[PDB]
Design a protein around this motif. Structure first.
Motif, short mmCIF file in Angstrom:
data_model
loop_
_atom_site.label_atom_id
_atom_site.label_comp_id
_atom_site.label_asym_id
_atom_site.label_seq_id
_atom_site.Cartn_x
_atom_site.Cartn_y
_atom_site.Cartn_z
N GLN A 1 0.84 -1.19 0.00
CA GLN A 1 0.00 0.00 0.00
C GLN A 1 0.88 1.24 0.00
OE1 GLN A 1 -3.44 0.03 -0.24
NE2 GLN A 1 -2.98 -2.12 -0.68
N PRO A 2 0.37 2.36 -0.54
CA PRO A 2 1.12 3.61 -0.61
C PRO A 2 1.33 4.32 0.73
CG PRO A 2 -1.12 4.05 -1.18
CD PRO A 2 -1.00 2.54 -1.06
N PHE A 3 2.37 5.15 0.79
CA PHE A 3 2.68 5.93 1.97
C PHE A 3 3.33 7.24 1.53
CE2 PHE A 3 5.55 7.69 5.05
CZ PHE A 3 4.83 7.63 6.24
N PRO A 4 2.73 8.39 1.91
CA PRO A 4 3.31 9.68 1.52
C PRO A 4 4.71 9.85 2.12
CG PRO A 4 1.76 9.99 3.28
CD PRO A 4 1.55 8.58 2.77
N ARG A 5 5.72 9.43 1.36
CA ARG A 5 7.12 9.50 1.76
C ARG A 5 7.65 10.93 1.79
NH1 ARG A 5 11.93 9.76 -0.23
NH2 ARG A 5 13.70 8.41 0.32
N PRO B 1 7.27 0.25 3.74
CA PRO B 1 6.51 0.97 2.71
C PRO B 1 6.82 2.47 2.59
CG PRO B 1 5.12 0.52 4.59
CD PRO B 1 6.37 -0.30 4.78
N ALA B 2 7.52 3.02 3.57
CA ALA B 2 7.89 4.43 3.52
C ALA B 2 9.22 4.56 2.78
CB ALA B 2 8.01 5.00 4.92
N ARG B 3 9.71 3.45 2.25
CA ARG B 3 10.98 3.44 1.52
C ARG B 3 12.01 4.41 2.12
NH1 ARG B 3 7.69 1.75 -2.70
NH2 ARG B 3 8.70 0.53 -4.37
N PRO B 4 12.45 4.16 3.37
CA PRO B 4 13.43 5.02 4.04
C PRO B 4 14.83 4.91 3.41
CG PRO B 4 13.16 3.04 5.29
CD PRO B 4 12.04 3.05 4.25
N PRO B 5 15.56 6.03 3.33
CA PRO B 5 16.91 6.05 2.75
C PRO B 5 17.99 5.54 3.71
CG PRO B 5 16.39 8.21 3.55
CD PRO B 5 15.10 7.40 3.64
N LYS B 6 17.66 5.48 5.00
CA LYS B 6 18.61 5.00 6.02
C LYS B 6 17.99 3.88 6.84
CE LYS B 6 20.44 9.71 6.60
NZ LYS B 6 21.65 9.43 5.77
N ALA B 7 18.83 2.97 7.33
CA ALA B 7 18.33 1.86 8.12
C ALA B 7 19.35 1.08 8.94
CB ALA B 7 17.58 0.90 7.20
N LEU B 8 18.94 0.70 10.16
CA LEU B 8 19.76 -0.10 11.06
C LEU B 8 19.06 -1.46 11.05
CD1 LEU B 8 22.03 -0.51 12.91
CD2 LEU B 8 20.71 0.37 14.83
N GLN C 1 24.87 -6.04 0.83
CA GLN C 1 24.93 -6.00 -0.62
C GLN C 1 23.53 -5.89 -1.22
OE1 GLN C 1 28.24 -8.78 -1.88
NE2 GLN C 1 27.59 -9.92 -0.04
N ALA C 2 22.54 -6.44 -0.53
CA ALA C 2 21.16 -6.39 -1.01
C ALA C 2 20.64 -4.96 -0.90
CB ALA C 2 20.27 -7.33 -0.20
N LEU C 3 20.94 -4.32 0.23
CA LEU C 3 20.51 -2.95 0.44
C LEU C 3 21.16 -2.04 -0.61
CD1 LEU C 3 20.83 -2.99 4.33
CD2 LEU C 3 18.68 -2.81 3.02
N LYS C 4 22.40 -2.34 -0.98
CA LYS C 4 23.09 -1.55 -1.99
C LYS C 4 22.33 -1.63 -3.32
CE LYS C 4 27.55 -1.08 -4.37
NZ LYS C 4 28.97 -1.56 -4.41
N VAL C 5 21.98 -2.85 -3.73
CA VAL C 5 21.24 -3.05 -4.97
C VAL C 5 19.89 -2.33 -4.88
CG1 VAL C 5 20.09 -4.73 -6.46
CG2 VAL C 5 22.31 -5.29 -5.42
N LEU C 6 19.29 -2.34 -3.69
CA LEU C 6 18.02 -1.67 -3.48
C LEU C 6 18.21 -0.15 -3.47
CD1 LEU C 6 16.30 -3.90 -0.78
CD2 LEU C 6 15.72 -3.66 -3.21
N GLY C 7 19.47 0.27 -3.55
CA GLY C 7 19.80 1.68 -3.58
C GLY C 7 19.71 2.49 -2.29
N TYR C 8 19.95 1.88 -1.14
CA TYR C 8 19.90 2.62 0.13
C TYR C 8 21.11 3.54 0.21
CZ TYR C 8 16.16 -0.18 2.24
OH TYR C 8 14.95 -0.75 2.55
N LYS C 9 20.94 4.73 0.78
CA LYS C 9 22.05 5.67 0.91
C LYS C 9 23.03 5.26 2.01
CE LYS C 9 18.92 8.34 -1.38
NZ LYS C 9 17.44 8.14 -1.49
#
Ligand SMILES: O=P(O)(O)OC[C@H]1O[C@H](OP(=O)(O)OP(=O)(O)O)[C@H](O)[C@@H]1O
Ligand SMILES: O=P(O)(O)OC[C@H]1O[C@H](OP(=O)(O)OP(=O)(O)O)[C@H](O)[C@@H]1O
Ligand SMILES: [Hg+2]
Ligand SMILES: [Hg+2]
Ligand SMILES: [Mn+2]
Ligand SMILES: [Mn+2]
Ligand SMILES: [Mn+2]
Ligand SMILES: [Mn+2]
Lengths: 328, 330
Positions: free
Chosen positions: A66-70, A180-187, A201-209
């Protein structure tokens, strides 16, 4: 129908990011039979899932979500695979409230196991909040909770097989990679040391900053009772190193000091903690996780980060945030 | 709960014959969820099923099989995994009635898979698929032949058909059919769809305690072939020997696979009639002669040229079709 992909799997051959994306798109849509979904999950398991496969799968699930106003400002996720074996308290959930009170904006994703997300209910926090208000709570309180179930409706087409299978599969690692908020950072915490590098390596492919994948002493987080293996992503660059409790200017403790209890107990634990009245080992483990997360926001002095997180805790100001949130 | 066995399978570890027996003893009684059965089948598929696991599984299926009064004299089965994608006529069924017509006792076991199959043929001839065990045993005594239709003796074999068709890929079940004859014959000519299954299956047969047996694969067919060499693994006096046979070893002309090809069930029924009556194609007669020839080797008849010559005189004699009608008369 994707018979062609399944035979590739049954031959111990890995899928492409796109082939995996198709397979998992069909899965969350219920296009597969119990037997097929299980053969897919098991064939991938026995062979060993690859980063491109994990990315393709996650890429699929998010598309269905479902969508989320990111928002535009910087925010992150603090979530783990869970199932670390060592019965502990809910570190990530507590760290989210302490982080939101220590400058950072945290949009946490995750669904009920006892366990987690259940104590959030106990604090009177509507788990089915609308995407509208969660975005509001995030702007005003620096934190919100995104309950998987309402964002990943198709996730239910895989639960039965997973339960009946009672074994770890790629779905265990896809849980954290689908906020679903497609955050650019994550622990992100992982239940095994062998998962630390793969996920990165997966997060890199997913394009996380900026992101960090952790595991230590059996905990799918930053540990206070022992060193924590880390894989950090930054500028599309990954680095491996290890951290210890003394790296945060904290004193090493014992896993046992961080042991869970029961619904009522745990609620009291986290309440009396965020209020600045918990144990020392509890405050330590949390501050350590918040300290590493703050590094994803550019604060590189783990010792100062830990000291601030600890004082923010002891301040009690964090609990006043589960209440501000519990009123919506 | 067999969770401990399933967790071992998911780690690429092989089960013992005992474990295998337990797991499949649970599968035939519909005790596993679709997800678990499929997980079990794929994990063994990917790793490669071992002889000891194949036996355990077959032993399990035979455990729940309906009873059948097993005679003391010598008799054998002649069946294959099928699924060779060859579309040939029904070799084993024809070889079954011809072998009997010259003195060999054959209690053939037939599986289901679709018309288009050996049982569908015998049914077309008028033969009762649901004949009682006593009646099939009485037919084996007097006619030297009888047919034991799987669905009649293996009621649990069904709890796996749904998953098997959904998965649309080969699994251990494709090779178990030929090993679960309810009369537990001491001799057997088993055919397989791939050359690498010949040795493993013969090794399983020994584990299952078969006296004399031969497993074969020939140029794509799960039968002894005459259009190309045949891969064989023979079990005799407790020892398995590997070798290949060629058309010339039987004294037979080498006809093409295409000349063995079949068609609709109706064509197949008439093809087999003409053949068994001594009026069919040379290719057909020759291919049957070669399979009967190896079969008789399991009965101490070591000269293949003679065996094949006997099979040919038996076919042109027309008695094999006589036994067909007689079996039907019961
Ligand atoms: O199998 P279990 O041992 O019950 O653990 C599994 C759970 O742990 C993780 O919580 P999260 O990463 O959100 O951390 P938390 O404990 O702080 O909620 C995850 O979200 C699962 O809900
Ligand atoms: O339908 P398929 O995909 O080919 O697979 C199953 C086949 O296995 C059996 O052969 P059997 O041992 O009865 O020998 P026969 O067919 O040569 O008589 C059966 O008669 C089918 O031919
Ligand atoms: Hg801070
Ligand atoms: Hg004979
Ligand atoms: Mn956690
Ligand atoms: Mn954890
Ligand atoms: Mn056959
Ligand atoms: Mn055949």
């Amino acid at each position: 129908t994707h018979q062609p992909i399944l035979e590739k799997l049954f031959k111990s051959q890995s899928m492409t990011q796109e082939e995996s994306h198709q397979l998992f798109a069909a899965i969350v849509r219920g296009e597969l039979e119990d037997s097929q979904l299980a053969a897919a999950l098991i064939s991938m398991k026995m062979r060993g899932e690859r980063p491109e496969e994990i990315a393709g799968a996650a890429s699929a699930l998010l598309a269905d979500a479902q969508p989320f106003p990111r928002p535009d400002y910087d925010f992150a996720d603090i979530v783990g695979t869970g199932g670390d074996g060592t019965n502990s308290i809910n570190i990530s959930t507590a760290s989210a409230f302490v982080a939101a009170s220590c400058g950072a904006k945290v949009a946490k994703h995750g669904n009920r196991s006892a366990g987690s997300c259940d104590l959030l209910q106990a604090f009177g926090i509507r788990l089915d909040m609308s995407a509208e208000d969660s975005r509001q709570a995030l702007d005003d309180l620096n934190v919100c909770f995104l309950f998987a179930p309402q964002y990943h409706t198709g996730f239910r087409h895989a639960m039965p097989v997973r339960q009946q299978l009672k074994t770890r599969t790629i779905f265990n690692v896809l849980g954290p990679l689908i906020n679903p908020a497609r955050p650019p950072k994550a622990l992100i915490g992982v239940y095994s040391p062998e998962l630390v590098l793969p996920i990165a390596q997966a997060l890199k492919v997913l394009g996380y900053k900026n992101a960090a994948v952790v595991h230590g002493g059996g905990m799918d987080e930053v540990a206070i009772h022992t060193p924590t293996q880390v894989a950090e992503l930054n500028n599309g660059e990954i680095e491996s190193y290890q951290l210890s409790p003394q790296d945060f200017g904290l004193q090493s403790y014992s896993l046992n000091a961080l042991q869970g209890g029961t619904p009522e107990e745990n609620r009291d634990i986290l309440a009396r903690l965020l209020q600045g009245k918990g144990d020392a080992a509890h405050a330590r483990q949390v501050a350590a996780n918040v300290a590493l997360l703050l590094k994803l926001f550019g604060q590189d002095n783990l010792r100062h980060n830990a000291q601030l997180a600890l004082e923010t805790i002891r301040s009690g100001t964090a609990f006043e945030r589960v209440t501000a949130l519990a009123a919506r």
